[PDB]
Design a protein around this ligand. Structure first.
Ligand SMILES: CCCCCCCCCCCCCCCCCC(=O)O[C@@H](COC(=O)CCCCCCCCCCCCCCC)COP(=O)(O)OCCN
Ligand SMILES: [K+]
Ligand SMILES: [K+]
Ligand SMILES: [K+]
Lengths: 258, 259
């Protein structure tokens, strides 16, 4: 039941127009913010040069170029590093490898050396099918468990016989809402307590992570706030559970369609 | 085809084991490099302060904090901006929207405004099922044409005393290798010509892009290289072609394996 050649062209045309609409609206939303940021940085640099007689713009440019190059490495220059705080923590390495197999790819931490890149390529290629098999198995198992639970929920007592599929739709909408409430809506509050993030920033981080976009501007562990009680393993297990459960819901929806 | 509970536990233990192994070896590979980086920037800052008596460590730290705040914004400080050129042009945001639906998410181009984050969430949730349906349709279309072509060639070819399984796995291996080399090795060469990146950097970028990891350390568009017109749309079409072909090949191999 493969799609018609002309049909595929219609979906492709729709995707292309979709992307054109998106590009125009991000352009119009987002150019003023970086216009003001460019103005702010150029005015700040001019004030710094004007106020400091001793400093030379060539030396300042060389120092800023070195600092931005350092940012690529991932080490923050603003704070003095103790050097018992290590970016590649066993916990951090576990979280990074988990994101690599999970295909999130935040990007705040990444391999830099030649072997690091080669091992990252090999590790991703070998790991991704394994995680895919795990997710498919957990999704199918959870789907069966959910369907038997659905049978238990449909007691058939005081149903009020309004419609045959009325309670099927009501149960599906209430389970999906409950799952979203616990998986996406509730962790956001934990994130607000732990890191003081805004509501939009936290909900955006959770959607980006569970949708496996992984922009990396917002990451679970950053800026030395001394997280406590095994923050990296619990958040990675959280990501696995959320991705699996929604993979199950999507698979069930597809089964219903078929 | 329900899976067993016992083997799910074993698979999860295997995944956790592999994660622990990877973390232990990554830590040992990667700590010395960043140790040297921290020492290098510490000694450079100390040398700078020693050279300039007038500058005061507090003002310099404040300046560094502002510069690293500006890096988050996405505007480079090293070069003076002409302002005729803008990061959020139609081509860059076309590529960005393509990455968002494609689930690459490089992260060098991210939305900071209140409206931008909300629209990014809505745009992702709307677009991703659409791209998923397009990829499934293209994958199955490629699979069907490949199946008919392989059946036709197999029927014409190998008439006399040859194992069918051997011929089938020879054909699949040769086809996958040819497609993989043409789609991955050749663009690494184009990237080598256009940019300063080494061969390992280019192959790493291509593997990270097609596999949907999207680390963002290396991206096709960067460093004010005055990239030729419509470079972002063509690279995005190449990304679409690579993902569709690889997904189709995986779909075919999986279906045949289960059949
Ligand atoms: C609050 C909202 C909640 C959201 C709901 C949850 C969302 C759940 C998941 C939704 C997003 C989609 C998940 C995608 C899973 C990624 C798995 C994967 O393997 O990546 C892609 C497939 O992987 C590949 O295609 C890799 C291609 C081959 C790799 C080539 C690398 C080098 C090869 C050299 C040798 C080749 C070795 C093997 C050759 C077969 C498939 O994803 P996609 O492209 O379809 O995503 C686009 C639409 N979402
Ligand atoms: K990603
Ligand atoms: K992904
Ligand atoms: K990513």
């Amino acid at each position: 039941t493969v799609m018609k050649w002309k049909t595929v062209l219609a979906i492709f045309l729709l995707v292309v127009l979709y992307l054109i609409i998106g590009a125009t609206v991000f352009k119009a939303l987002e150019q003023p913010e970086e216009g003001l940021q460019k103005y702010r940085i150029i005015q700040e640099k001019i004030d710094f040069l004007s106020m400091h007689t001793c400093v030379q713009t060539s030396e300042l440019e060389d120092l800023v170029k070195q600092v931005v190059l350092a940012i690529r490495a991932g080490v923050n220059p603003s704070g003095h590093p103790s050097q018992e705080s290590s970016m590649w923590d066993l916990s951090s390495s576990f979280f990074f490898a988990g994101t690599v197999i999970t295909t999130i790819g935040f990007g705040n931490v990444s391999p830099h050396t030649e072997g690091g890149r080669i091992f990252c390529i090999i590790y991703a290629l070998l790991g991704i099918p394994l995680f895919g098999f795990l997710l498919a198995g957990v999704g199918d198992q959870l789907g069966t468990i959910f369907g038997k639970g659905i049978a238990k929920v449909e007691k058939m007592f005081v149903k009020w016989n309004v419609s045959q599929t009325k309670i099927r739709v009501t149960s599906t909408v209430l389970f999906i809402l409950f799952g979203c409430l616990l998986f996406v809506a509730l962790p956001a509050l934990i994130f607000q307590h732990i890191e003081g993030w805004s509501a939009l920033e936290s909900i955006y981080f959770v959607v980006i992570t569970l949708t496996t976009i992984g922009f990396g501007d917002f990451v679970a562990g950053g800026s030395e706030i001394e997280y406590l009680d095994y923050y990296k393993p619990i958040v990675w297990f959280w990501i696995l559970v959320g991705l699996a459960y929604f993979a199950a819901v999507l698979s069930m929806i597809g089964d219903w369609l078929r």
